[PDB]
Amino acid sequence: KLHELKPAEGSRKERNRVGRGVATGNGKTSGRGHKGQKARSGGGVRPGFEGGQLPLFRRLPKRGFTNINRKEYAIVNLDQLNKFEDGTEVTPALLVESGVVKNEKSGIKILGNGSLDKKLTVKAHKFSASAAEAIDAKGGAHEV
């Protein structure tokens, strides 16, 4: 009822207010300490560092490059294919529909992690050595 309301147990907590007397425990200096750079309004040094010793991310070398023609493949392992009725046909337009592939980056690839225990025909862009052997090991077909 509107006159008897109760939030769930442990779901709320009161905020802490500083500079409100000595009995609270955060009264005078409000938890900052005594007379430093970190005790002034406006804060102190940058999150990485500033001044002083040479930073760690400046005494190490750079490495590598980025390829603009990069290709990433949506992978489906052999376990995710058991949801289909045995003897069915699997196509990239149906994996996205049934709820195995959410985003089709640059095609579908099948990886051999698990057990198949089916006789279904699957057609995808790429196959691995285990995926193609295990699929053909119990009856089936595949295409590219």
Binding site: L56, F57, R59
Partner: protein
């Protein structure tokens, strides 16, 4: 607004599966006549960022 990545730090580390960062070694640019064979062969291997350094630079690489 949005936080900004450290561009000079994103060119030097990579993210691993457990969440750590993989780095490269220093003291390998030149002056190799002054270093022994054992030193130069063992500076080819990679390392990981220490936990002492992680406590300071973790926020600079949050989108990476």
């Amino acid at each position: 607004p949005k936080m900004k990545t450290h561009r000079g730090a994103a060119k030097r580390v990579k993210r691993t599966a457990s969440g750590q960062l993989k780095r490269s070694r220093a003291f390998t640019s030149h002056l190799f006549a002054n270093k022994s064979t054992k030193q130069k062969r063992q500076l080819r291997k990679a390392r990981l960022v220490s936990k002492s350094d992680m406590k300071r630079v973790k926020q600079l690489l949050a989108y990476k």
